[PDB]
Amino acid sequence: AKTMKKIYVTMKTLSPLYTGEVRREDKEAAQKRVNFPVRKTATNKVLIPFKGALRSALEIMLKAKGENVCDTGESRARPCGRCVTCSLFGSMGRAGRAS
Partner RNA sequence: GUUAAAACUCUUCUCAUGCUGGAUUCGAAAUUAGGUGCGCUUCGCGUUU
Residue 15: C-alpha distances to residues 11, 12, 26, 37 (Å) = 12, 9, 25, 17
What's the closest the beta carbon of residue 94 comes to Zn ion, in angstroms? 10
What's the closest the beta carbon of residue 55 comes to RNA, in angstroms? 5
What's the closest the beta carbon of residue 83 comes to RNA, in angstroms? 12
Of the residues 46, 52, 67, 82, which one makes contact with RNA according to CB under 7 A: 52
Specify whether the CB–CB gap between 93 and 81 falls below 8 A.
Answer: yes
Query: Could you tell me which residues are beta bridge partners of residue 76?
Result: none
96 binding RNA? (CB under 7 A): yes
Specify whether the CB–CB gap between 31 and 38 falls below 8 A.
Answer: no
Q: Residues 26-65 vs Zn ion: string with x where CB under 5 A?
A: ----------------------------------------
In this structure, what DSSP letter does residue 12 have? -
**Contact residues for Zn ion, defined by CB under 5 A:** 70, 79-80, 83, 86
